[PDB]
Amino acid sequence: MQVWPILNLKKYETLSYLPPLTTDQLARQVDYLLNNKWVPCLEFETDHGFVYREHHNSPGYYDGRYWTMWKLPMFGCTDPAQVLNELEECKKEYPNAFIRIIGFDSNREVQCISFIAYKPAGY
Amino acid sequence: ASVGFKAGVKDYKLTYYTPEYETLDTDILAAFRVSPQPGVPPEEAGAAVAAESSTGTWTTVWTDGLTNLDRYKGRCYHIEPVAGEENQYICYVAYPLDLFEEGSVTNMFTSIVGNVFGFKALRALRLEDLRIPVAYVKTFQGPPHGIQVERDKLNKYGRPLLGCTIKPKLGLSAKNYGRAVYECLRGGLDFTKDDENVNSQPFMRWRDRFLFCAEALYKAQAETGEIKGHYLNATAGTCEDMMKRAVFARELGVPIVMHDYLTGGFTANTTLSHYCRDNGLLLHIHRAMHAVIDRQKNHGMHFRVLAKALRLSGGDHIHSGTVVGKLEGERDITLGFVDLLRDDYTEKDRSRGIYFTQSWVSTPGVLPVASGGIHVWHMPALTEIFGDDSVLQFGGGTLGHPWGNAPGAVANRVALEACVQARNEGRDLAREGNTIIREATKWSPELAAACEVWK
Amino acid sequence: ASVGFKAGVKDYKLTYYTPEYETLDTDILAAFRVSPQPGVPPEEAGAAVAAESSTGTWTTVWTDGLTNLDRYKGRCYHIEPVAGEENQYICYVAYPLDLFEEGSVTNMFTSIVGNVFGFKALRALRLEDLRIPVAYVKTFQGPPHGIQVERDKLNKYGRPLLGCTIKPKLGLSAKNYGRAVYECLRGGLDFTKDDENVNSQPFMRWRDRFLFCAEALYKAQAETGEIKGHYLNATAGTCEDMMKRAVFARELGVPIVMHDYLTGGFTANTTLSHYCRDNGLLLHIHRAMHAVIDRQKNHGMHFRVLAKALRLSGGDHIHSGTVVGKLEGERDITLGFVDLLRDDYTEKDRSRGIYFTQSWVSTPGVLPVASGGIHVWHMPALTEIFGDDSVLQFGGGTLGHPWGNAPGAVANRVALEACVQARNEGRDLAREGNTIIREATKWSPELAAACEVWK
Amino acid sequence: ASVGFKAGVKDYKLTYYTPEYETLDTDILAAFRVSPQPGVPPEEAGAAVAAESSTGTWTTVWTDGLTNLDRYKGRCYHIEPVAGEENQYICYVAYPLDLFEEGSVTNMFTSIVGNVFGFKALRALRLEDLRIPVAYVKTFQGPPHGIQVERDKLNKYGRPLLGCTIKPKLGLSAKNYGRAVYECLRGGLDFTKDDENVNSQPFMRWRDRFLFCAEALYKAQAETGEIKGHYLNATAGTCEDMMKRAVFARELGVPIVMHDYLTGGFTANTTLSHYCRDNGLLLHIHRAMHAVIDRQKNHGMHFRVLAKALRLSGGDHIHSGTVVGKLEGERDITLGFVDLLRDDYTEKDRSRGIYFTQSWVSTPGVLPVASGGIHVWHMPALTEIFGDDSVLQFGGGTLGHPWGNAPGAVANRVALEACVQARNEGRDLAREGNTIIREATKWSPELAAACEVWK
Amino acid sequence: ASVGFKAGVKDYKLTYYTPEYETLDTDILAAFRVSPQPGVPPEEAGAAVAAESSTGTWTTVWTDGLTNLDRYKGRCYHIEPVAGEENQYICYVAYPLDLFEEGSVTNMFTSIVGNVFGFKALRALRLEDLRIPVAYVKTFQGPPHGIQVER
Amino acid sequence: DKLNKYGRPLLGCTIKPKLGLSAKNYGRAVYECLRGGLDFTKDDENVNSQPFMRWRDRFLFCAEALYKAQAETGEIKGHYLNATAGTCEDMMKRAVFARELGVPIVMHDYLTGGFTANTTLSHYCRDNGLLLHIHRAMHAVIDRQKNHGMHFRVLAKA
Ligand SMILES: O=C(COP(=O)(O)O)[C@H](O)[C@H](O)COP(=O)(O)O
Ligand SMILES: O=C(COP(=O)(O)O)[C@H](O)[C@H](O)COP(=O)(O)O
Ligand SMILES: O=C(COP(=O)(O)O)[C@H](O)[C@H](O)COP(=O)(O)O
Ligand SMILES: [Ca+2]
Ligand SMILES: [Ca+2]
Ligand SMILES: [Ca+2]
């Protein structure tokens, strides 16, 4: 009988309960997006990588949901390598930031995916 | 309509059976499964269903001459035999837009289903489907939020959401109830839930439950960093009590409330739906009592009709049963009403029980909730059948884990994420489900423990 | 309850089938007609019904050890075969007082009937009766007024009350609708009525209808000197709209409003019932949609259960169908739930479908309303079957008279008074009904005209 | 009931003395200690008590024939002599459920005790006990929270709670009053309290007191880490002023308010009780004025009756006196009404003054508060007599400590915890109390200092 | 809609003049009397009226790729000359039901007539008629009473 | 003085496309614009409450976006939340939520909304400390032609 840990066990939604993705796994998730015609984009956050409530408390209001966009969504991107190269540029510039890959479905007209691609040391 | 009076009984048939009728885009269409009494021919039965759910009177009345009743009558415009059933037919009936009160599901059901089911010429009657015209759809608010907005508020993407009903439903004190809630949420589930029966009772008054559940959910959210919710049941005896409950949930700043729409009723449900929209609260709908009406094939109303009504009145989630434990066909029927709940347009498809093409003119979709005897081994199946836009609920499947609620939650969250990753990599969930689960047990003691207990 | 955990499925049977159980006066008792799947023995089925409508879980959960689940479980304490049916039994289940929210019919139905009807081990399930303990009865308001107070407010004694549904239900303008109302009331009927479908629609908005109906009823009252009423339908899409309608009726000073309790729902009905009590309004309840649930003998809920629920939630009148056109037994069943609606105490009587002795501890009785294809010739029968405390409604039976509404009303009022006088003189309505009617035609041209048209 | 009129006086006796009567489970039963005037036989006295507290009139009135008075009369069904008292008897009277307004303790007392005490045929009269039937119990809310919920909200388990009344009651300014509050709470007491007399007065207006007490309690809570409360007295001259006070306590987010239920009155108390339930406030009830009514053995009402009434109307705590300074019997009587306040079921026990078996059908229990001249040396006794579910209050016992409030508080908290630990280890508090206290002084200078001052 | 970004102006015409468009029963249709500036051909003017009363932007923006703008654009589906007027045409424009707030005449006018009348390529512009679809008509209360009830 | 901005024109940006974005993607655009140095972002005159983006959801996400941009830059930010509606009651509901959020500015299309509703909203803004941005939608229907209508200077004085 194991007791689920309490300290430093913050999660980042989809796929965050699995062992961290290898470059191959990461590339396979990116291909899923491309094959579905979804637009990939990267987001990073250096301050609080988790949800909190500072500016308001009414139902459905939370701070920390929006992170900052790395460049622009990658319209027309056809190669998972392009995306992963960007993840590298981003990590190079923000080695202290959490980085996640998100995707947009222009037909459903909504953001449709979001998975942590990089966590800074000790997370 | 009209007259040259002369009182007396008279006959339906010619007046209500209009096989030549071309339906209007503004008409509400109904598909009734009619089982006539022996000796009643099909045309006669169909005409009776139409007359009895609109203007048919048992004896001529002079006032009909003050209007044009043709403009108001229901019309049986088509009849077709049911295969593998003797003396059973599908009769299609058209109702003019003008018979209905705008925005009132209560009036829609009263008009179509309020009287016909007791007609003596029929042995049994079942409403299978309704085509709600877009001009009537526009008179309703629909879901307070709907699929797209819910995911955006919660910041949850690319996988089914996960919940857990707290058990035992009755018996726990508000505080022990909240303790169970915190242990479940901290393990990775997105929501916890009040049983449909949990309103306000001697051992656990509602306000105390709402309060401890709030403490538990905020603690789990702070610990995990992921947004959490607990479906706080607002179902009550009067509109006033229901509103008091919704108002306190608002005060607590929590994200979601719950209502048993059939036992509470459509009038109260529409009130709560409007309040949730105005206050930013998600609304989880429980279908308690549905089987009293939708179970038997020969009499009642099929659940797809009760699901359309809920999408109009309003709800963000609705229980749709599990597809597990049933043969195809029943699997196909479920997938059929699931499309009717989520999509903007669904084409007629008799193989899935969809009798009419249905458009929703951008009314938000409702998230279907799969619940009922499910555990980790059904995960590949559920993910395959429902896709991402669904809520999978595990009551016994979570609180029944050998190490407790938290590990029970971890097991379910890992099992789900393993399936999502596999599907995304191109693996066949239908063929490789058990292998996907087993591989995950290699690195997840929590999942391995669960897999040992069930199936 | 309790533990030494160890996760895993387990079996019901021993836990929920308690044939030795002695029921408490505080227990809510249910009589379910159970049709098990082939291979499921009766004790097993009864135990499933009890477990599935209370604490039964599909897999052991550790939290049961934090309470004493025995104190909360439903118990199947008796089973008896149904004669003339293979594999069909009546299973009696007891539910502890503590499972229910006080004053909430919504919670009572959710707890007993919210889940069991879909259990796979059952082929079909029907709730036949509920024994509501007096301690739970005391938590409800019951009828806003009830039989005794209604007669006192209206000053009407010694005969059934008479009403007439305005037809066609849809199509007339508010003013022509009111004209029909005035012609009906001035002829001797006590009430006129909105069809269950008449709420607020394109050709006749509710406020205009309420207003013209008020003018018509006041004019008929001033002309005849007898108090009149029109059941103004307050059924609406939301609680707010329903209240707006009730409030205007109050402003007009009229005596009675109406609500479709099943399509509106119990939560909204209880709100309207409380408002009527606080404002002195009588409440007529229409049972639209009942046959969707109560018609089939093997599945659903018998109407006697829906009638008890209404007496608790609140209503001054409730439609109970006609006893006409049916054989004894069905006649006996109706008379049985009529006693359950009107009396303070009704002893168990299986010959009339009364499975439990029921006490009401002075909760007011509800006036049953006989409606549906009746005319002057059924008068002796109706008077004999229902007695004085009933409302007899004639829609086509009034508006179908050859000389119009007023003479149609006179014919019904004379026919009823002739029967009452005859019964009071000791005449046998059952044997001399037709003779009593014929003698009255000798001095009533209106009645003679009606008798010529019907039967 | 009924008649054949003929005006005139007449005689009770035969009509109200019904020794053969079998009580109904719905009847309210009363045990009156009757001291008849010389010459009045017991049966005559008992019959007078019943007639005079129900339907007995001094002269025949014709209206009795319009009802069935038997259904409404009080009945003396049993009489038994009181030992060691000449001409004194216990007369049992049964009152039908229908005589009482639901949820109204005000009406319950008016009906039973509103008239009989002044009857000339009696020398004296005392109401000793009332059996409140469960059907009437269900019409009341009962405590806003009750024992179990209170401990869960406060997170305090396994020991009596501790409080301290601020003294002098009048004279301190709001700020100095708050200073005393902070020094008391920081030392280990859970609550501080307003004297029953402290409402709003020239030197200390209520709002200023509430405000400074809030600052003091929050500071003590932050310092110790344990949840604290101050019973803010909301007793006022009108319902409006009382509500204003409760509302500000709500605004401050504090946990508990107070009300003098007898001087404020039951109508106002029930209002405050309902408000506390709706707003999550605990309610401490002070019994000021009780001895005016319950002290003398021959006339008035015993406190156990005033305690049952409070449990129905609502309160979370209620003063029950100290068992200290009195012989057994009085000790037994106190323990008897303590069970009546806390438990769900109490069997008849004349050795403890319990005349009727009483069930509460899950109405929450009330925490008894021991107060009055107690100090550290009574601790083993109080813990033994009351057990964990009690509040022990020390006014002079805290503010009278030589080193001040904080050390005074520490002394009481240590003394209590020493006793709890000892009892839990199996030590006999009754025999080893003084030894348990003395051992604690060895390591607690605060306790040692207190022990030197008292007894 | 959609992208492969690359900022810059671009041209309307092909995008807003859809002479092959079959109107939906849910569309709000407008008949505009258009008087183009000299040199602006009719198809160009009609396309401008449609773009300028819906999704037309003066320079490409990247956010268009987050939606399907085709589902939201106004479309000039027909043009016909006005007799006895030189350089004056009737241009028909269709607007999707989704552009409008239910029950709000204020929003209906803001959307159709709020911006186009000041477009420089036009000399003058007049809205002659609107076809209000029944699904939008049902979102309004309409007259408090109306002819029949008033009498 | 409220905004603490002196000596230069203020800068804003209208979010485009006006219709089509979901409330959340709309808010994302708002945050990226504000964090770069603009003082305000804005709802198009057409953006009131519509099927793909109901008003309350937009107000809520725009609030999250603006507070995040303000915290990042240290400069006060605003988003013109369009309160234009079909009835006075709906317009007020919108202004009231903006007040609840503690945001600084709302917007109204004064000509399509109308002067009676505009004066009501103006009085409410004064009583609640809200700045009011006015959009002139429909002005060219009236003020464009030199021979007929009303010149804009008259609509500006009003
Ligand atoms: O309590 C549960 C399931 O608990 P568990 O997860 O332990 O099975 C759900 O409310 C029902 O399954 C819903 O019924 P329906 O799907 O028929 O609405
Ligand atoms: O409209 C009528 C009767 O009109 P008519 O008097 O002309 O027959 C009544 O509403 C139904 O009979 C009630 O149905 P139920 O009795 O099944 O509730
Ligand atoms: O003020 C005090 C005690 O102060 P101290 O703790 O200094 O004795 C209490 O209110 C009374 O004892 C209660 O009376 P009763 O118990 O009769 O209700
Ligand atoms: Ca459940
Ligand atoms: Ca009817
Ligand atoms: Ca005192």
Ligand SMILES: [Ca+2]
């Ligand atoms: Ca613009």
